[PDB]
């Protein structure tokens, strides 16, 4: 059932996401990110995303309205 | 009376605060192979008229399939 809910949280992926660049990590599942719209943010990170994929300011996708790392 | 009601509805929509912008160029879109019924779209292949692309005063360039209440031949980039 946890594997069902792990797939279930992927609703927030959707399709119209903006693109940003990750900057630094603050604590567990919460970090800052720099949107390409211009401004800088402090967002929440989903637990489904592995932490291997972030290091040298990689390109990431953020939500539109909530503006969280997805 | 029937046509004048439509003339009344046109002047309602154009209120007054119109944004101004620039016309970048004029295009023309050819139809495609076969447009599927039940998923067809008017602002697509079934438009053999003219078209234009417009850069707004807010430095955002948009697109419009129907030029609207202007003759296309008068407009120049």
């Amino acid at each position: 059932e946890f594997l069902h809910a792990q797939e279930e949280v992927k609703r927030i992926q959707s399709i119209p996401l903006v693109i940003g660049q990750f900057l630094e990590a603050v604590d567990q599942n919460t970090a800052i990110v720099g949107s390409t719209t211009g401004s800088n943010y402090y967002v929440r990170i989903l637990s489904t995303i592995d932490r291997e994929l972030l290091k040298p300011n990689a390109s990431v996708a953020l939500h539109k309205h909530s503006n969280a790392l997805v | 009376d029937k046509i004048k009601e439509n003339s009344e509805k046109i002047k309602v929509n154009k209120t007054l605060p119109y944004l101004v912008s620039n016309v970048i160029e004029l295009l023309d879109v050819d139809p495609n192979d076969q447009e599927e019924d039940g998923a067809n779209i008017d602002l697509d292949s079934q438009r053999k008229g003219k078209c234009a692309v417009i850069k707004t005063s807010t430095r955002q360039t948009y697109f419009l399939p129907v030029i609207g209440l202007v003759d296309a031949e008068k407009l120049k980039p």
Binding site: - | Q34, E36, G38
Partner: protein
């Protein structure tokens, strides 16, 4: 020819409601409908299906009625909806292939030059994959008959598209699925394969002992076509085969042993980490 056919799950789910439509009597109601797909390559896909009426008697296997006008009318209708799909063939809900179906295929072959048929088990009480597919060929024999039309098998499978997969997964919430758990569903696949092999061999034994003991004529083919089955099954008690089999079994057992050895120290690491981080914490807390 046509290589293989792919069935989307919108079809073979539209079939079962067609059987629920006028299968109230439920005795010999061979429900027939017309497929809709697109032969984009030698491989084939079907996506839509609709209905045609059909009545026939229990005996008298020559009296039947394929509606021409309904076929043309609803084809024009679905063309007014969907201009991409063209007709490919038909489905009948008979559990086994019948005797008068070749007349139906020869009748409908005017609309499609290679009209495949899909047998769909509406009530698959036998385990296995439903929706087998057949196509018509010429099987000119040396017996003396010039030619006949008795079909042959084409490989089939249920495919998927990126929207119907969502529907069939969400509607599968009344069954537990252990497909995510590995090293278990492979064993169930082995068990299912063993049961299917047993069922097929039981059918072969039933037919062979039926034609063997007086009843039914001895078909001069099959009995020597199945003779080449028994020329196979090589000797398990062969020296070089056993010598190679142990040579590869040990090579697999090396990897299994190293996997156990690489698992045990991770378990020990978790154990001593939990014990140290527990005992120091209770030293602080007390």
């Amino acid at each position: 020819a046509v290589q293989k056919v792919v069935v989307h799950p919108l079809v073979l789910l539209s079939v079962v409601d067609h059987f629920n439509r006028i299968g109230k009597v439920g005795n010999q109601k061979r429900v027939v409908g017309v497929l809709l797909g697109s032969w984009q390559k030698k491989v084939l896909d079907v996506s839509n299906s609709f209905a045609v009426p059909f009545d026939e008697d229990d005996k008298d296997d020559s009296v039947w009625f394929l509606d021409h006008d309904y076929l043309e009318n609803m084809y024009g209708m679905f063309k007014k909806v969907n201009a991409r799909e063209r007709i490919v063939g038909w489905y009948h809900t008979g559990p086994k292939l019948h005797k008068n179906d070749i007349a139906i295929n020869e009748l409908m072959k005017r609309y499609c030059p290679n009209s495949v048929l899909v047998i769909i088990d509406v009530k698959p009480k036998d385990l296995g994959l439903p929706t087998e597919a057949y196509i018509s060929v010429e099987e000119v024999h040396d017996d003396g008959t010039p030619t006949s039309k008795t079909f042959e098998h084409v490989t089939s499978e249920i495919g998927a598209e990126e929207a119907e997969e969502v529907g069939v997964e969400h509607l599968l919430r009344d069954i537990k699925d252990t497909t995510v758990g590995t090293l278990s569903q492979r064993i169930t696949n082995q068990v299912h394969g063993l049961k299917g092999l047993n069922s097929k061999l039981l059918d072969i034994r039933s037919y062979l002992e039926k034609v063997a003991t007086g009843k039914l004529p001895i078909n001069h083919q099959i009995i020597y076509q199945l003779q080449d089955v028994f020329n196979l099954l090589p000797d398990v008690s062969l020296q070089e085969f056993v010598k190679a089999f142990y040579l590869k079994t040990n090579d697999q057992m090396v990897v299994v042993y190293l996997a156990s050895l690489i698992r045990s120290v991770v378990a020990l690491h978790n154990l001593i980490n939990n014990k140290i981080a527990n005992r120091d914490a209770e030293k602080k807390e007390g």
